Design a protein around this ligand. Sequence first.
Ligand SMILES: C[S@@+](CC[C@H](N)C(=O)[O-])C[C@H]1O[C@@H](n2cnc3c(N)ncnc32)[C@H](O)[C@@H]1O
Ligand SMILES: C[S@@+](CC[C@H](N)C(=O)[O-])C[C@H]1O[C@@H](n2cnc3c(N)ncnc32)[C@H](O)[C@@H]1O
Lengths: 529, 529, 464
Amino acid sequence: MNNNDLVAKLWKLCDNLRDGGVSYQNYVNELASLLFLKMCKETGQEAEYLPEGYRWDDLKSRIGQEQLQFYRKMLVHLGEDDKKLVQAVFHNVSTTITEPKQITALVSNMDSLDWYNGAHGKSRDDFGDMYEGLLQKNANETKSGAGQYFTPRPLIKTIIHLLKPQPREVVQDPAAGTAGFLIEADRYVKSQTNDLDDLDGDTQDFQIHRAFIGLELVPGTRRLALMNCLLHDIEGNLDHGGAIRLGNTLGSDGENLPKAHIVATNPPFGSAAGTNITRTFVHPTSNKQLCFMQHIIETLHPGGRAAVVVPDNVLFEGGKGTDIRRDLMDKCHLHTILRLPTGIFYAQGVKTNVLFFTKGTVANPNQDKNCTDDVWVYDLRTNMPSFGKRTPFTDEHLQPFERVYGEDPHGLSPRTEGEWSFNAEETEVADSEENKNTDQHLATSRWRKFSREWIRTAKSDSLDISWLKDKDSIDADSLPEPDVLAAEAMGELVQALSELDALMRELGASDEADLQRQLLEEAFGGVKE
Amino acid sequence: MNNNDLVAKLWKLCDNLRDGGVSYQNYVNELASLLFLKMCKETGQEAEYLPEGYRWDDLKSRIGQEQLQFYRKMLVHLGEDDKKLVQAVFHNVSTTITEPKQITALVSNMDSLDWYNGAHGKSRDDFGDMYEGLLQKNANETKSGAGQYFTPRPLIKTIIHLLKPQPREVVQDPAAGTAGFLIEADRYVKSQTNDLDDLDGDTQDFQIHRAFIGLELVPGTRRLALMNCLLHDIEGNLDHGGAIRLGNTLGSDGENLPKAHIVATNPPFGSAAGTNITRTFVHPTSNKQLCFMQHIIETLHPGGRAAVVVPDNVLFEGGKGTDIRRDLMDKCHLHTILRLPTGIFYAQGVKTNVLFFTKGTVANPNQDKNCTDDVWVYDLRTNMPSFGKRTPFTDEHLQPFERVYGEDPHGLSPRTEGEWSFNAEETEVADSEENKNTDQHLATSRWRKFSREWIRTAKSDSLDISWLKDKDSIDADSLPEPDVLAAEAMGELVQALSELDALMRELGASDEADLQRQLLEEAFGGVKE
Amino acid sequence: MSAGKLPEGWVIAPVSTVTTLIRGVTYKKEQAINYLKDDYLPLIRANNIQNGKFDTTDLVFVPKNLVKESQKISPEDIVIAMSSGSKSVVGKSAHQHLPFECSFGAFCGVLRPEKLIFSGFIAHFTKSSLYRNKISSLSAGANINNIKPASFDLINIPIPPLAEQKIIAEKLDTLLAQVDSTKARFEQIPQILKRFRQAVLGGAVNGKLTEKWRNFEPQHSVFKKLNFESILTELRNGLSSKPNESGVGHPILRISSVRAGHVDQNDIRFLECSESELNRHKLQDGDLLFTRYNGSLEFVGVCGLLKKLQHQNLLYPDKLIRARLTKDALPEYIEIFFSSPSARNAMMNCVKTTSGQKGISGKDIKSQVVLLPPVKEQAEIVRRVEQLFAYADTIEKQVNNALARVNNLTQSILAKAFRGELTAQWRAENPDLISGENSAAALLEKIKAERAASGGKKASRKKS
DNA sequence: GTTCAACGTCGACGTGCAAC
DNA sequence: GTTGCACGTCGACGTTGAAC
Ligand SMILES: C[S@@+](CC[C@H](N)C(=O)[O-])C[C@H]1O[C@@H](n2cnc3c(N)ncnc32)[C@H](O)[C@@H]1O
Ligand SMILES: C[S@@+](CC[C@H](N)C(=O)[O-])C[C@H]1O[C@@H](n2cnc3c(N)ncnc32)[C@H](O)[C@@H]1O
């Protein structure tokens, strides 16, 4: 997506919505509906698309409450009808606008609007793109609260990139939201396919209708997602209304949802929106996020794969969280964990991570237990530049992680520890089991692996793993290899050095490395004794 | 106007509204409409009140979108009809609720609700009171933004108290909002009247219909206000729908509004809601608040009186602000200014004041200029306890101000400077023109008066008058009267004292007041030289 | 070899095993009046530990409330920790002299067994950075921005013999006292400086003084307003959209830069094209600087002075305000004058915090009162003031190293206090052996060699 | 009894550009 | 050239009570 002049133009319109009573979160939804009707008229074909009596002119001509009421009426009429194509967009649609004066102003304003962000031919796509971008701004905005849906663009790109969705594969998004992941996935497939040109017609139909699926609780959000896909040319299933279905993941809808080869999603954090957990799970839990995880495991086909953005919350949480986690490692093969930096999301405080795992194992797709042997972790979070408007989070930041990650989507590719990006070396190291019996160089590396048994024993089955410490200090770096190996040891060894310096002054020894080594040989040994 | 168990009960219902898409600000409006319909049914008389086909059962029975759509339809139907009594409540009414699931839940929830906060007989009043109280909470809440309307309860009480509205007098509120002031004013009148029993029937009708008037831009807010008055038994004008009219003060409606004897209002701060200033004024200004002030001056009858809550912005602001300010003093007699403390309002940062003035003068009600001779100021703000949930702002804080204020509503009562409440003495005095040539005791006083000429010359017609500092320090207090008189002088005189102490030590003089005075006599004189 | 190099004498044990009881506390129903009303027993919150040692209790908690609440009564001489409020993981500790008290969820009481472990020993132990490093291993934590009591119990710490623990703790306590002492002197010096500020500006060096509009002043001095002496300018900002402006080569100094201090250069700069079209004001060196937005602590002022060789010059944003001295003035002298609190008092009185706030009007600055001393005198005064500030800086440095010293000692003591050798005193017939600075060291060396030799007899001596 | 937070509470330090 | 804000936006320290 991209936006510029048009988004600014769109932004101005939102002012009416703001004054209207519409929330920031619902600006896009409000705008999208009106634009759709407007565009239909612009097509000239609108008779085909819209029913008679309910069209742009009908709405446009009206004013005041009379107009507002008409708008409501129009929304209801559109939402319900055999013409599911249009009806899906309109399904469960309603306007938040209370102030009648605002509606009149808004309709007229956009009515006069140009194709200003356009291109040769109608740039329907531009509007949708601009629409998403504007939505992104709202998502970014803290006040709106829209941000819950918000996900970093580069994050999505990377996730799909690693997954490498192929054609004929079904991609699912339990928390579709705007359908950010689905669109990206589709884009990825097309980029490979030459826009599906490479594929046969049958496969092409599959990708268009069947390939991607999503579910959204909020009807308002669903509308936006539907429009997004529509411009994206993702028709989906007409019966359902399109690619994104309206329903509760946690409820009956979720179970009804079809199984999928690949799953990429960012579930909501916190208690979440009104979503009752009517559905039973292996381990029942109040944790909404945990509930999603169980769902993801269930839907995946044997040997399926998925990446899930999760709050840090899931990693250690005791009680059922421990049980579920254990369940995850047993049923799935959790190969990689990515620790995200902070400031990336609309919400500031939240710590987030990305989990990578496979359903069962490649060798044994139907392996119930002991799937997860080793886990790799990447510490993107500590000692990182503060992100913000000033410091944007970009694709470049992610690139090092992806490299170590390996081309294999399963994560099977060869891997070795030893990543020192973002001034990894400079960063301080923590003392513990994590960096226990660890060499100096390794301790600094962002990329490290851990054994299942270790996690079980030391971690006590806690995913919250990290070696590094967030600081900033300067100290001369002359130490023995064994000294560096033990983080804890450093304090004791260092003390010895202080005394040595005093003696050296009296001696008047020159400042040379060799001299230091000679002294260290005797002094160092003494400490060992 | 209190709440307790019921408000908590109502609060729970709001959860549906929250999840529904309704804003915090619009919780009350949403609840109020439903409760009204419900109550009508409870009356059993509803056939009289509501039209057939549109009633509680009709709405109650429906579910889902079908129900939601019914609700919108019902709202429209009620709002428009010859039956202005009901129609006023419903006028420009609309529900913010997007989520169909929420509506069904909400209707059923309240439907099952009890008279729980009630009393012998239907406690319709209780619901309204609880309603306002709940509204107050929202007003208090920062997130809601409802707080813009919010005003301190004790503040309103005091304002009406000072005004002392009488019967047959017309009270106006350009920014009626919930009609907090109007209800208080009505209460004040009744308390005097024995609930109007003392008054004759004709006068009684006057008070009920004619006595109070208000105007509200937002239809949503107006609805709430209307309901408030209704429970309060303030019918107002049926043509208009009731006491509170719907319209723009700044627009044609404002001018159309009738003249009033008394005006008490708290206009909105900031740019304000969508309110275009279609109306011309003596001094045209972008300042919304300034615009209101001009309006108030205009509406008041000769010899009228009013109190207005205003931000500090108005006092100092130059440009047109100076012109308007000058205009105010010329046309009106601005006797008193109250500087409010902070933390009282929903918004933290805002600094507010209360202006008291009369239209023209008592002696000459039609006096165009030179009305304002002297101005009294009360510094309630500095050196005050931080208010908050923990530290509430109460009536007691206000009592000292009212005492000095004087019983006379015009502010004519005798007045003298000399108020040292809230540890006024302890407060730090600052050095400037206001405390210029001021004695030590007077400088500390919160209650002080200033001349018009002084304001003109020193202040250069700036209302922002302030004598005190906010600090906290301890120093021995031995000074000459002239020293204390000059704030600036203190630094110089104090320096002399430091040296004196050293000499005293050598002398070994005892610690006595007389000794200090003797030394001061010689030392003090030297400085003067 | 274990958590770290550990001596023969010591063993590594978990706190849980060593500690008799570890538990949290909870919070009571605030709504009920009765719980709080008329209460004997003290209640503690997180803030309590932070403020010094826990002698006092801010809130009061009734036993009736106690029964209903999970909160429990803690014993005296008990160590306490805070779950929340840290650099993600660290943790806090405290001791309670006052009788048994209660707390809430964040706090976790811990009781040491009699003679098993000392409270003092543990307190210092936790304080150690090594302790912090160990914990940092968990990380910021995922879903936890606190310290879980369960995790707390897991912690492993080495244990000294009872005798040494007392001796070791004693040594550490003493250091702590020393740092405090330096702090006291530090505070006093600004007080002295403060006096000079007031006396010098107003008093001046003279001896004959007369009454003045602005307080008593010397006879020689003269009075004038700011506007007379200097000129005020206002300034505007460019539009971010145009990238052309983005090219630069010419400095722009924002308030933030002002916060930094003396300003030769600025973080952001604007292009000449910008200055031409924008018509920004250019500034020469030696110019005064003032802060128009932010305010400071409410209505107050800030100052600064520009520097330049023939080579460079500076321009600034709207937020900053500039003043130029016509012919006669010493920029440094004036700058100090502005910062003086006397000015602050005059300014604040003239305008209390009002809506116009966190900023100063041009009118206010120009109208400002100022004295005019002679050029020579001005220079003399300025030099004196600047010099005093330098002294303050030096003392601060001294404190820092002292802290470092503690760090070094603690590290050594951790390993060594941990060896049995520490409990035992060095073998010596006479106390004189230790008395000499050199002699004591020599004695230590001899003892070490002899002990090792004797140890040689059995591997177990060294091995265990 | 006690556990947990796309955190809750207390500030800290300054708008910046549309408006005239 | 320059003025104004029921301000607009950004670090420090610890939730507290509903839930089980
Ligand atoms: C962080 S957003 C997903 C953003 C998405 N990755 C994107 O590209 O925009 C999480 C979404 O989960 C949805 N959600 C919350 N609870 C749900 C539930 N029980 N069932 C289905 N979706 C739910 C929310 O409405 C929200 O849109
Ligand atoms: C602070 S509130 C008044 C609160 C009132 N004192 C009470 O008791 O609740 C200011 C009110 O001014 C209204 N308002 C803003 N602009 C207006 C306009 N142009 N005309 C009429 N009312 C306006 C707002 O909608 C708001 O309710």
